[PDB]
Nucleic acid binder design. Sequence first.
RNA 1: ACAU
DNA 2: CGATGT
Length: 136
Amino acid sequence: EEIIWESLSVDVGSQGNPGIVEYKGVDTKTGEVLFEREPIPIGTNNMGEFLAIVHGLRYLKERNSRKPIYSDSQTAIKWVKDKKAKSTLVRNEETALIWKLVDEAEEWLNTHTYETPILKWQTDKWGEIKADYGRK
RNA sequence: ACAU
DNA sequence: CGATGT
Ligand SMILES: [K+]
Ligand SMILES: [K+]
Ligand SMILES: [K+]
Ligand SMILES: [Mg+2]
Ligand SMILES: [Mg+2]
């Protein structure tokens, strides 16, 4: 329908999938970068999309903001609503960091409330989400 | 089949 | 072409 311009948009970027993962959140209206995570050596697209939403929830909660969050990831939206990231990535020594972050994000969801609406960015109708990394 |  | 996910 209509873009809600008063919102936060988040997205993952990577070098390979699985591969090096990063994510960021931007003001949908202005494009200003509000947060960007230092690259994580190995993760998946969906783990990064999930972390990006949870980071957005935490960022907005700390600022008393009721803005919605846009994500282009059906998977990550579902994982956040379930409070469970059902990733297939092997959990071993190489993937320890991403799994630690995912575990901690789940723990945050299980210990806090939020009213932030989590909305699907409608890429087919509106083009690329404003937090996209432009690598495709 | 659809979302990344 | 490879990959992650519902
Ligand atoms: K996309
Ligand atoms: K991109
Ligand atoms: K598939
Ligand atoms: Mg995305
Ligand atoms: Mg993108």
